[PDB]
Write a protein that binds this DNA or RNA. Structure first.
Length: 979
DNA sequence: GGGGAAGGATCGTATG
DNA sequence: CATACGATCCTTCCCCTAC
């Protein structure tokens, strides 16, 4: 009584399935979407594309006769061809046939006459022979183009204009049915990409969750232990873009009540449990598998228990659409172990999953941390609360273990419900964050598969997109390589132009940030930074300068040596434009067009009410345009990172050095121009300059304030006029700066932008500033603060960090008369901290709660001391004949909530720990001083750790974490003094 | 890896 | 005036996630 994928799809959309089968009967062209891409390495190369048709059917399509090739840059001739033939034959490499052609080298500028270079293309039958031949030819010093060595489906995506994450049209195929999967065989000239907006996708995502058991109480279950078992396997199948359950199931050992919302299958053993899981997987055939933290606890434990019982081979072969495979191949090539997934520049994750062909695995946790690289709490509850979704049901783990042990068939239904809701929340997060469409659009722009957009970094994607744009081209097939060459020199680039910030509470004149709009791509656009326009020899550069060519000179100090170079300018002619400027200009034009389209779609969505039967497609188009513009942004902001990476094939030290030096030169020019115009400089950071208007421009506006009744409302009037005059003057300042830049570099791709006005403002140090933000009209009554640098977004251990950090900032940023004896930042911190300490009643009890875990095997000192004190108290109460029921020990692994209390005359954390129930029973003081000292002063020290008094002497090595110690000690002394 | 709690001697310094 | 306090350098898990 189990319903397979075909019947479910037929039940969902009958008319679409009828149209699909009518098209299939007549062998008409149809539509396909790939999700997981698998390729065979040995033997004849056939590329398998797994995915879904437009109704929801599972389709495998194999692309036969893909041309497998790579290019070598030698002079084409009979003698050279014979020599290369002998070289390939001597090291027993099987070749198919050879071709000759002409291509443009990517490194080094050449004139028009010598623009093309001869290349010989080697055709091959298998990928293994190609990899051996490419290694042999690279070891002999020959140059190699179209030289991908890791994955070859990127070659198929690049050469054929065939995105592997977008729709593909099947024409002239060969259908063959084998049940739940439909097999097509296609010739690569019979495949085309679907240009316009495709229909609604109908892929299937299976969200699964596992609940386990361990005889050793209070310890996380471990796969290696023999007694450790899985007992709940709960999984649901959803659409790619919906949260409604298509079909749900629970696979169990312990008896459970029949439920009308999901199907429960009873298994008498763990082996039968795993086989039932595999059978339901095979019957449903997910396009995508998912689950929260499934690559670190779920899949390893499943595969370890499958290996222990010796059923891994049969489970894999039932769950995979590929042919039969043996256990060694499954453990070697398909079960990945210790794979590294990158979040940011300093964070990496270890993941392990079973990549069965026909289904692509995604961790919800990996996407959640990729979208929020600075997230501090990475639990499911934390992400659910941040994203504003329904939280998990309150079921403790020890209660689950106890109810499993009692074998009570009635209430294991609650355990199943908890596991199914945990499965639901994963795809709830996936739909709410719109991860899969964003990855699809990244793949469309990058010509990669979805697997690469999920588990690989974006730098390789940018490199792939650049190669894809280069190889097609409009002016003659620019050829480029992929593997890196030359010595990977390591060093530090020259430092940025440091501008000393004028620290303090600036509330006499407004400041405003002039920002370079996409500075590094703009300099790449303007100065024609491309590898094929680079000249290294000085004599060649002089010869080009002789024949009426415009060049840009770059010179920088790297590793104590002078690196110099010349770049050929395009002179505002698209024919002479380089590869990087062409790619960036195309991406910027696309971004502008989609910005216009998104504005029109948003206006239409605001116009059209939700009751009309057209809101779904409008929201769906809005989702596509938002995803597309986000992908365009993430590729455009990554060009400099890929250009500066040493491992990149396109890496060129003059290119990165010239980009940095040109940014330096333009920032210096803007700085000098602004100073010579009379304006002031407050802060400068790479691409941003904060400008303060001259005093004289305000004079008349100030004069009416001095001759008035001199009241408060007069001062808000003064501030209002101040902001208006600042905006009006500095818009013209920005226009003149743009005109000067255009007159300097000769192009119009480098412009400045007027982001918002900051008044009053506070710069506390390097990359640490805040203030009131004004966008078009002044509003000083707002509670929204423009913040950068200060880590106010930190829940930490208490909510007092939030409250006091906000209160300091708000007390600093209000308007004050020039006759109210303006206190500096340190005095404001002093008075707000005194107000916090003295006025105890302003706080509530719930902000003083902390949570901890009681694990009687770990050497957690404070928890050990608290539990020892509680045990001593319980023994003392029992000796006195007192029923210490609410003093009882927690169950092992059970989280408990505590507070800190005053202890009259140790100072350790443990002796002040008390239970929440005990604290509310006795109404004890909550010892605000300890909380303030250990949690609030960390943030409060960030505000005054650049003052003159808190400075190191000259004879000290460490300069960063050496003044905050004195700041914290000074605040400690002040807090202890105020009593 | 980055922050949280806990443990020890001696110089730096002070006082009845 | 020689003891007693105290803070800094430095060292060791523990929490983090999933049960």
């Amino acid at each position: 009584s189990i319903m397979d994928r075909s019947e479910i799809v037929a039940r969902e959309n009958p008319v679409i399935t009828q149209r699909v089968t009518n098209l299939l009967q007549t062998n008409a062209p149809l539509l396909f979407m790939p999700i997981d891409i698998h390729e065979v390495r040995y033997g004849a190369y056939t590329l398998f594309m797994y995915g879904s048709l437009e109704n929801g059917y599972k389709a495998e399509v194999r692309i036969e006769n893909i041309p497998v090739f790579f290019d070598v840059q030698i002079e084409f001739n009979d003698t050279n061809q014979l020599f290369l033939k002998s070289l390939l034959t001597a090291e027993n490499i099987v070749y198919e046939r050879l071709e000759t052609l002409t291509q443009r080298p990517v490194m080094g500028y050449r004139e028009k006459e010598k623009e093309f270079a001869p290349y010989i293309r080697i055709f091959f039958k298998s990928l293994y022979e190609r990899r051996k031949a490419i290694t042999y030819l690279n070891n002999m010093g020959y140059n190699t183009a179209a030289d991908d060595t890791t994955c070859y489906y990127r070659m198929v995506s690049r050469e054929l204009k065939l995105p592997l994450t977008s729709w593909i049209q099947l024409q002239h195929y060969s259908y063959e049915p084998r049940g739940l999967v439909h097999r097509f065989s296609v010739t690569p000239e019979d495949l085309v990409s679907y240009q316009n907006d495709g229909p609604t996708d109908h892929s299937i995502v299976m969200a699964y969750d596992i609940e386990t058991y361990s005889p050793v109480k209070g310890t996380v279950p471990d796969p290696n232990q023999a007694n450790d078992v899985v007992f709940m396997i709960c999984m649901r199948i959803f659409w790619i873009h919906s949260t409604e359950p298509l079909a749900s199931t629970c696979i169990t050992m312990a008896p459970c009540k029949k439920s009308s919302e999901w199907t429960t299958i009873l298994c008498s053993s763990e082996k039968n449990l795993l086989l039932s899981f595999a059978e339901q997987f095979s019957r449903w055939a997910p396009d995508i598998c998912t689950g929260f933290n499934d690559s670190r606890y779920d899949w390893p434990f499943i595969v370890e228990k499958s290996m222990q019982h010796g059923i891994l081979e049969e489970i894999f072969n039932k769950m995979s659409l590929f042919w039969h495979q043996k256990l060694d191949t499954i453990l070697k090539c398909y079960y990945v172990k210790e794979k590294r997934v990158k979040i940011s520049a300093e964070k990496s994750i270890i993941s392990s999953f079973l990549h069965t062909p026909g289904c692509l695995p995604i961790d919800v946790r990996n996407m959640c941390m990729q979208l929020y690289p600075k997230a501090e709490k990475t639990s499911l509850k934390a992400f659910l609360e941040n994203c504003g979704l329904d939280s998990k049901v309150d079921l403790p783990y020890h209660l689950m273990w106890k109810y499993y042990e009692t074998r009570d068939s009635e209430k294991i239904a609650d355990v199943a419900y908890y596991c199914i809701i945990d499965a639901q929340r994963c795809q709830d997060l996936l739909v709410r964050h719109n991860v899969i469409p964003d990855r699809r659009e990244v793949g469309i722009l990058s010509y990669t598969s979805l697997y690469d957009c999920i588990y690989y970094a974006g730098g390789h994607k940018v490199c792939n997109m650049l190669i894809a744009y280069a190889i097609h081209d409009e002016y003659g097939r620019i050829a480029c390589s992929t593997i890196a060459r030359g010595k990977r020199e390591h060093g530090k680039y020259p430092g940025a132009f440091v501008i000393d910030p004028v620290k303090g509470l600036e509330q006499d004149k407004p400041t405003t940030g002039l920002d370079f709009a996409s500075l590094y791509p703009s300099l790449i656009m303007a100065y024609n930074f491309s590898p094929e326009k680079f000249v290294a020899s000085r004599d060649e550069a002089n010869s080009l300068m002789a024949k009426g060519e415009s060049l840009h000179y770059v010179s920088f100090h790297f590793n104590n040596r002078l690196v110099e170079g010349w770049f050929v300018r395009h002179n505002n002619v698209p024919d002479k434009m380089g590869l990087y400027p062409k790619v960036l200009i195309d991406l910027l034009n696309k971004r502008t067009a989609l910005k216009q389209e998104l504005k029109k779609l948003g206006e239409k969505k605001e116009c059209i009410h939700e009751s009309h039967p057209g809101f779904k497609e409008l929201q769906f188009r809005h989702a596509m345009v938002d995803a597309k513009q986000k992908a365009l942004k993430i590729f455009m902001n990554t060009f400099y990172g890929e250009a500066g990476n040493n491992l990149s094939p396109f890496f060129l030290l003059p290119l990165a050095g010239g980009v940095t030096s040109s940014g330096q030169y333009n920032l210096k020019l803007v700085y000098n121009f602004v100073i010579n115009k009379g304006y002031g400089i407050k802060y400068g950071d790479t691409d941003s300059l904060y400008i303060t208007c001259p005093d004289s421009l305000y004079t008349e506006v100030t004069d009416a304030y001095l001759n008035s009744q001199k009241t408060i409302k007069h001062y808000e009037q003064l501030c209002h006029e101040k902001v208006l005059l600042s905006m009006k003057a500095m818009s013209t300042l920005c226009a003149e700066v743009n005109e000067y830049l255009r007159q300097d570099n000769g192009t119009s791709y480098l412009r400045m932008a007027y982001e918002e006005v900051l008044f009053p403002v506070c710069f506390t140090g390097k990359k640490k500033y805040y203030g009131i933000a004004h966008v078009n009209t002044p509003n000083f009554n707002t509670k929204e603060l423009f913040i950068r640098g200060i880590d106010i977004i930190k829940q930490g251990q208490t909510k007092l960090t939030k409250t006091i950090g906000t209160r300091i900032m708000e007390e600093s940023m209000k308007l004050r008369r020039p006759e109210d004896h303006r206190p500096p930042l340190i005095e404001i911190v002093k008075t707000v901290l005194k107000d916090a300490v003295v006025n105890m009643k302003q706080w509530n009890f719930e902000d003083f709660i902390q949570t901890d875990a009681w694990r009687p095997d770990k050497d957690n000192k404070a928890v050990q001391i608290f539990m020892s004190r509680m045990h001593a108290r319980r023994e003392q109460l029992k000796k006195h004949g007192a029923a210490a029921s609410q003093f009882a020990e927690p169950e092992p692994g059970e989280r408990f909530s505590y507070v800190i209390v005053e202890k009259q005359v140790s100072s350790r954390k443990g002796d002040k720990m008390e239970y929440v129930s005990e604290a509310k029973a006795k109404n004890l003081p909550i010892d605000i001083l300890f909380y303030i000292n250990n949690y609030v002063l960390g943030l409060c020290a960030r505000f005054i750790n650049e003052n003159e008094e808190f400075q190191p002497p000259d004879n000290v090595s460490n300069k960063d974490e050496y003044a905050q110690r004195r700041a914290k000690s000074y605040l400690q002394k002040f807090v202890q003094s105020i009593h």
